Design a protein around this ligand. Structure first.
Ligand code: UD2
Ligand code: MN
Length: 478
């Protein structure tokens, strides 16, 4: 009638009643412990800073919202939970939120109108009372001893921003499934999140301790833990971002560049319900992405626009207060981030005309592992690099490592060969034509052509209508 109640006495049958398989689960339903064996018995500390848990939402399924909430209360030592702040971001039925205010520790905040996730998180952060923030989606389920490992890290160094491994809760059947602990957040020049294997070096490093924290260039997304002061000092979130994501890019760039670090803490596990086709699970409105790139990427932004020319036409708002933030924080340049934080991301030479994979539909130019005077071919694109990595240079050659596509015989039907690059060589000079849709051999009417793949390899051929002569570099600078 007016009282707060302990989570087990909450009337879930009532709340939920008033995909579907969500309402079938109990609010405190059991889930497999997906942790490494060594997390089992590590001894976590009593003397850790309590946290305010901000969960922001807009028309979340009640069964899932509730499940997140109890998940936190059930699996976190209660002395480390100061409060759980739910930010209702103008859900249509205010009751979805307000009803949960009845539970111990929960506090619910309402928005007049859709403010989006960024602004909602800032609201929750501001309302928080604890020294440390924990942000979670409205559809998560925390696993055993999920919280202590995160807090241990920020307690020790305020400038760490730490994420759990994010397990997967299936959107259809709600099976809780363990994710890998052997991956890092990354991206391609199109600023699309991808997962990376660890440094063959980094793997060795971890032999002595397989559950050690792991530095990550790019945050997996929204579940993370951060000192409240630090959060505010580094400028919170970009309040001008619209509700379509890519705040992950901006926060990752900002923390790293401005002196902080990002981490993934393998002993910390939180399930998440992934939407269909989300970039975490399946391998673009650019506003937010441009706001990141135009403030943080210095001149490398031009590789983003090389990958995504469409994006140069997307208006992105005023970024002045953000540029000023960067100045004040004396943040290091993007060049530094690439060299120190994400050296494995392949960066074109600043005088390369085009770079990346050279693809024809969904096939990619491939060396076939043919390291000297070899013929060349195609494989299905795999968006790793290696044998599928090429550049069009200032010198006008199509090169992979220090080998160059070479017209060895100008007769139509002649196979091209991969030879050592020489700037002398007229036989290794190529140019883009027809709006960067083909490769013509400079000084001829010969075009790179896959007609012959099944019969020897790629060939030079008289430039024509053939679609076996269509080739697009992933990045073009013209
Ligand atoms: C587990 C994880 O890493 N999740 C991230 C991922 O979430 P998801 O892609 O799973 O989406 P989400 O869970 O953040 O939100 C679900 C939908 O409701 C919207 N919504 C949600 C809350 C809110 O306060 N206001 C609002 O408008 C949101 O715009 C989205 O379309 O991608 C997001 C980019 O947008 C953020 O990086 C999330 O934190
Ligand atoms: Mn989500």
């Amino acid at each position: 009638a007016e009282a707060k109640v302990r989570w087990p006495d909450f009337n879930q049958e009532a709340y939920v009643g008033g995909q579907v398989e969500s309402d079938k689960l109990r609010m405190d339903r059991a889930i497999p412990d997906t942790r490494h064996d060594q997390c089992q018995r590590k001894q976590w500390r009593v003397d850790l800073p309590a946290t305010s848990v901000v969960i922001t939402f807009h028309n979340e399924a009640r069964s899932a919202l509730l499940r997140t909430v109890v998940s936190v209360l059930k699996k976190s030592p209660p002395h480390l939970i100061k409060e759980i702040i739910l930010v209702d971001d103008y859900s249509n039925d205010p009751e979805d939120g307000a009803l949960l205010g009845k539970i111990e520790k929960v506090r619910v905040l309402r928005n007049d109108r859709r403010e989006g996730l960024m602004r909602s998180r800032v609201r929750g952060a501001d309302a928080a009372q604890a020294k440390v923030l924990t942000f979670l989606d409205s559809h998560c389920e925390c696993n055993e001893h999920w919280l202590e490992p995160l807090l241990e890290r920020v307690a020790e160094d305020r400038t760490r921003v730490v994420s759990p491994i994010i397990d997967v809760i299936n959107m259809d059947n709600f099976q809780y499934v363990g994710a890998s602990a052997d991956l890092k957040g990354g991206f391609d020049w199109n600023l699309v999140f991808k997962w990376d294997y660890m440094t063959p070096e980094q793997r060795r490093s971890r032999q002595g301790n397989p559950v050690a924290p792991i530095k990550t260039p790019m945050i997996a997304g929204g579940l993370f833990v951060m000192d409240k002061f630090y959060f505010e000092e580094l400028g919170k979130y970009d309040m001008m971002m619209d509700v379509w994501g890519g705040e992950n890019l901006e926060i990752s760039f900002r923390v790293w560049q401005c002196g902080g670090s990002l981490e993934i803490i393998p002993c910390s596990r939180v399930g998440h319900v992934f939407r269909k086709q989300h970039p975490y699970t399946f391998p673009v409105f650019a506003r937010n992405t441009r706001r990141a790139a135009e403030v943080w990427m210095d001149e490398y932004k031009n590789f983003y626009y090389a990958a995504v020319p469409s994006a140069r036409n997307v208006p992105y708002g005023n970024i002045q207060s953000r540029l000023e933030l960067r100045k004040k924080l004396s943040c290091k340049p993007f060049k530094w981030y690439l060299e120190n934080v994400y050296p494995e991301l392949r960066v074109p030479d600043h005088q390369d005309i085009a770079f990346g994979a050279l693809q024809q539909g969904t096939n990619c130019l491939d060396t076939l592992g043919h390291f000297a005077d070899g013929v060349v071919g195609v494989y299905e694109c795999h968006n790793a690099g290696g044998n599928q990595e090429w550049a069009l240079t200032k010198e006008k050659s199509v090169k992979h490592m220090d080998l160059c596509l070479t017209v060895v015989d100008r007769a139509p039907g002649s196979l091209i060969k991969l030879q050592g690059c020489r700037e002398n060589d007229s036989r290794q000079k190529w140019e883009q034509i027809e709006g960067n849709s083909k490769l013509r051999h400079v000084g001829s009417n010969l075009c790179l052509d896959s007609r012959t793949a099944k019969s020897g390899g790629l060939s030079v051929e008289v430039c024509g209508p053939a679609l076996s002569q269509q080739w697009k570099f992933t990045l073009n600078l013209q």
